[PDB]
Amino acid sequence: MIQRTPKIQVYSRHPPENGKPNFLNCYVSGFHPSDIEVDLLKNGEKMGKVEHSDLSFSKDWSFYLLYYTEFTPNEKDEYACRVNHVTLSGPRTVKWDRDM
Amino acid sequence: MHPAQTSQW
Amino acid sequence: GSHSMKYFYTSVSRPGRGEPRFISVGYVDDTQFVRFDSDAESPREEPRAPWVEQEGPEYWEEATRRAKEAAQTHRENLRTALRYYNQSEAGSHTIQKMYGCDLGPDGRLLRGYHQSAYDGKDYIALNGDLRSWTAADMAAQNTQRKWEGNRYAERFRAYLEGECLEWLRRYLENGKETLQRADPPKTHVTHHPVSDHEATLRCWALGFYPAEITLTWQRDGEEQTQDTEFVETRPGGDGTFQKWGAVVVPSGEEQRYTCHVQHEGLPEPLTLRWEP
Ligand code: NA
């Protein structure tokens, strides 16, 4: 019964420009078991609409999911992905960094 | 599409 | 490109909450085209790419039937695994199965797959001869013996060499306009100071397809691995992929570093330098 901590990447579909509509992604991978919670937050509050891909995995059995929503970035607002998993001691929040 | 085949463990 | 159909099944038991959840996802190359989820509102095989959506009711009826069959088999396998491993009906467990076929340059099967995991570890896998099995442990050896006695490699090899490849060719032909594409990456180098003496150079590749790519950093033409960070290739959301690789560099030394990008959609590997 092995357990594996998720990797988290939070990133935009397209290079960001202030005021230009875009897509906000949270890509969680490499976790076991598959039971996981992922949220997209703006200014510390869960987004309005956030959907995800169907659970799949890579050849080494490592699960992956994409959570995504539309967003229009700007200098004032902060965007973040929050993950809950058995391997994490309470939620892990990763901020969206336009450099990554 | 899936394969009509499948055997058990 | 070199083409592939693959299905990925995950079953997860959940005692106290009914039958195990079964999820199947189907891919042509790096494009998901179908899904079955036993927890969807009307569980059936659902299209996930526009082109397959035009398959008639026979396709959906049979595909659903086979997915449900796969789900039932995985329920039996979960139960069987409780016996083999001496485990309780009250705990949660996971089976993952991947299988599929690679279409060779001669229109023949280049490579076939049929491999599974129990609770995140290898259970049993079909070897590349498509005629023998590797069992990961003594429990999976029970399954090996069974499958050897019932000629299962032979039956599954017939699907991989025949029907699997037939479906793959149909899908490729049907969804040609979108599946038989090689989108090169849009590439660039960014620069992000770490301190007043160190900076990060980040080489970006965006909007590429298929997912296979190579991204490396060189310093003075020498492959650099020290102070390097490459992120896992990640989906764009729109059927494209992205990756970046960064190096941490002494301030003033930036122009000794080149990033190198290889991708099937590129007529020739790329060489990039920070262009402020
Ligand atoms: Na046919």
Side-chain angles (χ1 to χ4, degrees):
Chain A
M1 185 54 89
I2 65 124
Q3 46 181 51
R4 299 293 183 259
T5 302
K7 295 174 215 292
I8 318 304
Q9 299 192 65
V10 46
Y11 58 99
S12 53
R13 184 180 290 174
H14 304 290
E17 302 167 62
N18 297 138
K20 209 176 161 292
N22 205 323
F23 308 76
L24 180 65
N25 296 321
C26 191
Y27 184 64
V28 185
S29 65
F31 58 95
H32 191 92
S34 59
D35 304 80
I36 199 159
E37 287 190 8
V38 179
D39 289 299
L40 287 173
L41 319 175
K42 177 176 185 166
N43 302 324
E45 298 189 69
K46 281 167 65 176
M47 250 157 160
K49 191 165 86 168
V50 178
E51 300 162 89
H52 64 97
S53 60
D54 303 307
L55 183 74
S56 186
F57 48 92
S58 32
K59 298 338 153 308
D60 56 280
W61 310 119
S62 106
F63 286 115
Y64 62 82
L65 284 168
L66 178 65
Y67 285 70
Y68 56 86
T69 191
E70 308 192 315
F71 88 134
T72 303
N74 56 62
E75 301 296 25
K76 66 163 181 163
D77 298 306
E78 201 163 285
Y79 298 87
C81 181
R82 185 181 73 202
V83 178
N84 275 293
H85 193 259
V86 70
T87 61
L88 300 164
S89 196
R92 183 178 193 243
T93 305
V94 184
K95 291 181 200 181
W96 177 61
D97 186 342
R98 62 187 74 207
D99 292 341
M100 273 168 73
Chain B
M1 170 191 293
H2 318 256
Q5 294 82 338
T6 198
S7 198
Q8 306 181 222
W9 274 12
Chain C
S2 306
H3 303 295
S4 226
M5 185 173 79
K6 284 179 174 70
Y7 285 78
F8 300 79
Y9 302 165
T10 308
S11 287
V12 177
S13 63
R14 46 181 175 188
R17 324 203 299 279
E19 323 150 48
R21 188 178 189 165
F22 177 83
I23 295 169
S24 158
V25 295
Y27 284 78
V28 172
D29 301 328
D30 300 312
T31 306
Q32 192 211 340
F33 73 98
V34 280
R35 134 222 232 231
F36 181 90
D37 182 346
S38 64
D39 269 14
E41 294 314 301
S42 276
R44 69 198 148 92
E45 188 91 328
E46 279 182 48
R48 283 291 180 267
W51 54 263
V52 71
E53 210 177 328
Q54 195 141 255
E55 292 285 354
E58 345 81 55
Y59 181 89
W60 306 106
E61 275 139 18
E62 182 65 14
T64 300
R65 197 198 61 83
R66 294 178 187 201
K68 291 207 172 134
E69 183 73 1
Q72 174 61 49
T73 297
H74 265 214
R75 289 193 295 268
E76 292 160 15
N77 288 356
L78 281 163
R79 290 198 276 277
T80 292
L82 295 181
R83 262 218 324 293
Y84 294 171
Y85 289 104
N86 193 38
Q87 298 168 320
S88 157
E89 295 182 1
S92 183
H93 302 276
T94 305
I95 301 181
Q96 285 162 275
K97 185 182 185 173
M98 183 276 279
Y99 65 87
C101 45
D102 295 347
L103 179 63
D106 62 351
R108 220 139 289 166
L109 178 77
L110 183 56
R111 214 175 162 180
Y113 313 91
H114 184 302
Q115 54 203 43
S116 62
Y118 186 57
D119 289 336
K121 300 159 284 291
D122 290 349
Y123 182 79
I124 201 169
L126 184 63
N127 296 331
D129 64 8
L130 309 176
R131 277 154 179 92
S132 57
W133 305 94
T134 299
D137 64 32
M138 211 78 104
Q141 285 185 9
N142 294 323
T143 299
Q144 190 175 6
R145 288 186 288 272
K146 252 200 242 339
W147 289 1
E148 276 162 3
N150 75 4
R151 311 178 72 125
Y152 181 55
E154 186 186 320
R155 285 139 57 214
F156 202 78
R157 175 190 153 277
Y159 162 77
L160 290 175
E161 289 177 342
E163 173 180 7
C164 189
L165 246 37
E166 281 157 21
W167 283 113
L168 172 55
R169 292 182 280 243
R170 163 181 221 176
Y171 297 146
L172 287 172
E173 194 158 1
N174 288 355
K176 169 168 198 161
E177 285 185 353
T178 56
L179 290 167
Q180 316 196 32
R181 81 175 147 119
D183 296 343
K186 284 157 165 52
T187 60
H188 73 277
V189 178
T190 53
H191 178 267
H192 322 276
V194 171
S195 64
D196 278 320
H197 306 301
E198 278 189 329
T200 300
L201 291 165
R202 180 163 285 109
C203 180
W204 297 79
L206 311 162
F208 60 87
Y209 182 89
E212 180 58 34
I213 201 160
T214 300
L215 248 68
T216 58
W217 275 104
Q218 280 175 23
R219 180 193 148 185
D220 305 320
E222 289 167 31
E223 247 259 89
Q224 263 262 306
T225 323
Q226 226 70 52
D227 303 301
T228 300
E229 177 185 11
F230 299 95
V231 291
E232 188 188 339
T233 298
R234 66 200 193 187
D238 59 343
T240 63
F241 298 87
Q242 319 188 338
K243 197 190 190 61
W244 61 246
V247 271
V248 176
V249 141
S251 177
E253 294 319 303
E254 287 84 349
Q255 299 297 322
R256 295 167 64 200
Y257 292 85
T258 50
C259 170
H260 305 262
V261 183
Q262 312 188 113
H263 185 268
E264 93 171 62
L266 295 166
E268 324 243 7
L270 288 179
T271 293
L272 294 93
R273 205 181 302 276
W274 184 38
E275 310 278 352

